[PDB]
Design a protein around this motif. Structure first.
Motif, mmCIF file in Angstrom:
data_model
loop_
_atom_site.group_PDB
_atom_site.id
_atom_site.type_symbol
_atom_site.label_atom_id
_atom_site.label_comp_id
_atom_site.label_asym_id
_atom_site.label_seq_id
_atom_site.Cartn_x
_atom_site.Cartn_y
_atom_site.Cartn_z
ATOM 1 N N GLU A 104 -10.732 -15.107 -6.420
ATOM 2 C CA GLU A 104 -11.060 -16.277 -7.216
ATOM 3 C C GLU A 104 -10.416 -16.169 -8.573
ATOM 4 O O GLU A 104 -10.367 -15.088 -9.177
ATOM 5 N N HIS A 132 -12.277 -11.036 -8.970
ATOM 6 C CA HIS A 132 -12.321 -12.404 -9.441
ATOM 7 C C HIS A 132 -11.673 -12.306 -10.807
ATOM 8 O O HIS A 132 -12.093 -11.488 -11.611
ATOM 9 N N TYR A 172 -11.060 -14.329 -14.110
ATOM 10 C CA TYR A 172 -11.379 -15.481 -14.937
ATOM 11 C C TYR A 172 -11.284 -15.025 -16.388
ATOM 12 O O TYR A 172 -11.418 -15.816 -17.312
ATOM 13 N N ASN A 192 -19.849 -11.645 -2.166
ATOM 14 C CA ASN A 192 -19.280 -12.239 -3.373
ATOM 15 C C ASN A 192 -19.934 -11.803 -4.682
ATOM 16 O O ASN A 192 -21.135 -11.910 -4.833
ATOM 17 N N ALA A 193 -19.110 -11.357 -5.627
ATOM 18 C CA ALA A 193 -19.507 -10.905 -6.971
ATOM 19 C C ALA A 193 -20.860 -10.255 -7.179
ATOM 20 O O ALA A 193 -21.725 -10.833 -7.823
ATOM 21 N N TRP A 245 -23.714 -23.597 -15.654
ATOM 22 C CA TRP A 245 -24.513 -22.523 -15.067
ATOM 23 C C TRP A 245 -24.384 -21.226 -15.869
ATOM 24 O O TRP A 245 -24.966 -20.196 -15.514
ATOM 25 N N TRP A 273 -9.715 -20.880 -7.459
ATOM 26 C CA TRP A 273 -11.064 -21.348 -7.290
ATOM 27 C C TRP A 273 -11.132 -22.865 -7.196
ATOM 28 O O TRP A 273 -10.825 -23.635 -8.130
ATOM 29 N N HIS A 286 -14.344 -20.684 -18.247
ATOM 30 C CA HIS A 286 -15.674 -21.269 -18.099
ATOM 31 C C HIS A 286 -16.212 -22.011 -19.323
ATOM 32 O O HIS A 286 -17.425 -22.042 -19.553
ATOM 33 N N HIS A 290 -22.187 -15.548 0.360
ATOM 34 C CA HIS A 290 -22.109 -16.018 -1.009
ATOM 35 C C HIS A 290 -23.461 -16.384 -1.588
ATOM 36 O O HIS A 290 -24.319 -16.903 -0.889
ATOM 37 N N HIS A 291 -23.628 -16.119 -2.882
ATOM 38 C CA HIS A 291 -24.844 -16.443 -3.614
ATOM 39 C C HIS A 291 -26.147 -16.056 -2.919
ATOM 40 O O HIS A 291 -26.990 -16.903 -2.633
HETATM 41 O O1 LIG Z 1 -20.154 -18.653 -12.123
HETATM 42 C C1 LIG Z 1 -18.755 -18.942 -12.184
HETATM 43 C C2 LIG Z 1 -18.074 -18.462 -10.902
HETATM 44 O O2 LIG Z 1 -18.405 -17.076 -10.720
HETATM 45 C C3 LIG Z 1 -17.776 -16.542 -9.545
HETATM 46 O O3 LIG Z 1 -18.063 -15.138 -9.450
HETATM 47 C C4 LIG Z 1 -18.306 -17.264 -8.316
HETATM 48 O O4 LIG Z 1 -17.690 -16.722 -7.139
HETATM 49 C C5 LIG Z 1 -17.967 -18.740 -8.435
HETATM 50 O O5 LIG Z 1 -18.506 -19.456 -7.317
HETATM 51 C C6 LIG Z 1 -18.578 -19.276 -9.721
HETATM 52 O O6 LIG Z 1 -18.223 -20.656 -9.884
#
Ligand SMILES: OC[C@H]1O[C@@H](O)[C@H](O)[C@@H](O)[C@@H]1O
Length: 311
Positions: A252, A195, A197, A134-135, A209, A285, A204, A94-95
């Motif tokens: 997520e 993911h 969202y 991840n992403a 961030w 998430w 968000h 991740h990241h």
């Molecule tokens: O940046 C918003 C979200 O993006 C997602 O792709 C990440 O996996 C999360 O950890 C993050 O909080």
């Protein structure tokens, strides 16, 4: 000789314990993974837990890019710790920001990180899954992601052909780059994760961030045409999967606390149902932090929110 789809149902519904191991150092972001957490999660009725991990800051930057042992040892504590409560687990890289902004330069280190990880856990319970990365985003474009994911597969399988592998999508892991996704024909035990969202401005609204996320603060959710959009996206997902022979996992999905509980419960509930309708596995998430469903210091779930995640 494993059936990924059969493995996808094993995984089922679960949740992320984030703002933990994917932070520069565990705690940096507020959450420190307690062994007791796995009790709550289990008794709570979840089938698995997803643990985001930022290996990139806990491993040497020079060949052979070895992973530092105290950390490695720490991941072990967390793996078997979830396995105890009978929960299945998903771990990932991740990241790894430098890899997203300069893939070619970090590609080598990346492959090396998985070689180590796959080996360290190649004989663990088959209820432990490996999420490539991840992403993917930025300069780790869709077409480039396809090349890198395939080589991670070659790195993993050579070590073990027992664990199911989770392959995400590019352009931040949503549906934008889904179509462009290419999983090798030879891989027969992988699951595709997305993911979700989507109502980004909603999920968000106020994410510190995300630049320009201030213009979203205050949004609500629960309208007609509202769900028709999301439904066509779920169908898009579903059509891709049916035409690609790959299971889906919604790794997520969640709404940031700054949104009003009501529209957060409506969205979660809706999306969870749409996810079960298509028999997708998924993980909300994060457990307790800024997207939390369980308030750590006060021992109490947001039962309605939790009611929406659980069947
Ligand atoms: O940046 C918003 C979200 O993006 C997602 O792709 C990440 O996996 C999360 O950890 C993050 O909080």
């Amino acid at each position: 000789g494993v059936d990924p789809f059969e493995r996808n149902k094993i995984l089922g519904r679960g949740i992320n314990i984030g703002n933990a191991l994917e932070a520069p150092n565990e705690g940096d972001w507020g959450v420190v993974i307690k062994d007791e957490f796995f009790d709550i999660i289990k008794e709570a009725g979840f089938s698995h837990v997803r643990i985001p991990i930022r290996w990139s800051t806990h491993a040497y930057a020079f060949p052979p890019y070895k992973i530092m042992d105290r950390f490695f040892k720490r991941v072990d504590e967390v793996i078997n710790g979830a396995l105890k409560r009978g929960l299945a687990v998903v771990i990932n890289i991740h990241h790894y920001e430098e890899l997203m902004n300069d893939p070619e330069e970090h590609k080598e280190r990346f492959l090396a990180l998985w070689k180590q990880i796959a080996d360290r856990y190649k004989d663990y319970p088959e209820t432990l899954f490996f999420e490539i990365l991840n992403a993917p985003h930025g300069n780790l474009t869709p077409e480039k992601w396809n090349e890198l994911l395939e080589e991670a597969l070659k790195v993993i399988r050579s070590i073990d052909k027992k664990h199911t592998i989770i392959i995400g999508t590019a352009e931040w892991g949503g549906i934008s780059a889904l179509e462009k996704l290419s999983v090798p024909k030879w891989e027969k035990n992988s699951i595709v994760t997305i993911h979700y969202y989507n109502p980004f401005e909603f999920t968000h609204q106020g994410a510190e961030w995300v630049e320009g996320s201030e213009k979203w603060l205050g949004r609500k959710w629960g309208s007609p045409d509202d769900q028709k959009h999301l439904i066509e996206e779920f169908n898009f997902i579903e059509e891709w999967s049916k035409k690609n022979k790959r299971p889906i996992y919604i790794g997520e999905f969640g709404a940031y606390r700054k949104a009003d509980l009501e529209s957060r419960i409506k969205w979660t509930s809706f999306v969870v149902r749409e996810m079960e309708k298509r028999r997708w596995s998924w993980a909300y998430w994060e457990f307790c932090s800024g997207f939390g469903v369980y308030d750590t210091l006060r021992k109490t779930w947001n039962k309605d929110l939790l009611e929406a995640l659980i069947g």
